[PDB]
Amino acid sequence: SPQSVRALLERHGLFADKRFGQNFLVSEAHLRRIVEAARPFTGPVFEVGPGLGALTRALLEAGAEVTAIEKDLRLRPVLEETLSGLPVRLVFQDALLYPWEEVPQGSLLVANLPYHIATPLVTRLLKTGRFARLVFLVQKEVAERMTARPKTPAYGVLTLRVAHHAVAERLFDLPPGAFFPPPKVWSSLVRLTPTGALDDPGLFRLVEAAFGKRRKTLLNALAAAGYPKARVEEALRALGLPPRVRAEELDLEAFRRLREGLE
Numbered sequence: 001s002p003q004s005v006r007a008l009l010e011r012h013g014l015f016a017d018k019r020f021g022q023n024f025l026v027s028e029a030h031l032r033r034i035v036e037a038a039r040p041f042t043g044p045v046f047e048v049g050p051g052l053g054a055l056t057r058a059l060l061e062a063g064a065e066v067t068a069i070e071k072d073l074r075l076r077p078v079l080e081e082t083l084s085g086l087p088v089r090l091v092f093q094d095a096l097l098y099p100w101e102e103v104p105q106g107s108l109l110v111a112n113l114p115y116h117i118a119t120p121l122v123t124r125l126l127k128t129g130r131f132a133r134l135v136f137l138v139q140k141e142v143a144e145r146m147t148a149r150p151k152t153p154a155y156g157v158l159t160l161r162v163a164h165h166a167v168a169e170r171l172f173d174l175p176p177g178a179f180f181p182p183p184k185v186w187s188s189l190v191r192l193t194p195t196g197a198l199d200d201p202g203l204f205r206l207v208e209a210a211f212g213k214r215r216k217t218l219l220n221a222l223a224a225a226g227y228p229k230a231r232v233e234e235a236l237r238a239l240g241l242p243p244r245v246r247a248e249e250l251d252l253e254a255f256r257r258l259r260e261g262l263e
């Protein structure tokens with residue numbers, strides 16, 4: 001209930017703080033969808049932003065071993081209340097500072113992520129190579145980026161970052177009313193399933209360069225970033241791509257081949 005969430009906040013003298021991107025899940029049906037997207041719980045679960053503990057409780061009740069990382073210390077009493085009697089390790093810390101590279105191989109991320117950290121956090125977790133599955137809520141626009149196909153407005157660096165590490169699924173869209181307080185945009189449930197690759201800095205130097213200068217062809221964008229123009233011309237030719245092809249027209253394999261051609 002939006003009422004129960006409002007009432008719970010009121011009882012604990014809390015107000016949702018925009019500095020923490022606080023928008024708390026209201027629907028048991030959405031909670032169920034998140035748990036069902038993440039299961040089976042074959043490794044330890046990390047939840048970033050447990051908030052009032054709604055998803056934390058759902059995860060624990062499904063038998064997950066949970067570490068929940070919450071930056072807002074004001075939420076400690078409600079979390080302790082919600083999670084009374086349940087084995088959750090509550091960590092009061094900025095999740096952007098948590099030692100992610102050390103989590104057990106096979107871990108899971110399951111989280112209603114704060115909008116302002118979702119992209120750098122997911123990027124970092126994917127670079128660790130440690131997760132079996134990452135299941136999380138993001139703004140619909142960010143989900144679209146993470147799941148974009150080439151030659152579309154949402155297609156870009158983030159799409160390619162996700163794709164390099166993982167297959168990506170947008171499973172469900174949630175309206176603003178799924179949260180209290182309601183945010184201004186729709187959200188989406190995303191599932192990422194890592195496929196083995198760790199960071200490839202050479203590849204991402206190329207990908208970042210490709211998309212840096214948006215109004216240029218791929219060739220001129222790379223040339224402006226310091227890639228030898230003649231070599232880019234040849235690599236594109238060898239790929240059977242048009243001289244004026246744009247960055248958003250290349251899929252992950254094409255970028256991998258382009259990188260290989262440049263070197």
Ligand SMILES: CSC[C@H]1O[C@@H](n2cnc3c(N)ncnc32)[C@H](O)[C@@H]1O
Binds near residue numbers: 020021048051
């Ligand atoms: C969508 S609700 C977001 C949840 O994440 C928490 N949160 C916001 N920023 C961070 C952060 N940097 N690390 C951990 N939790 C956070 C918020 O306080 C809230 O419970």
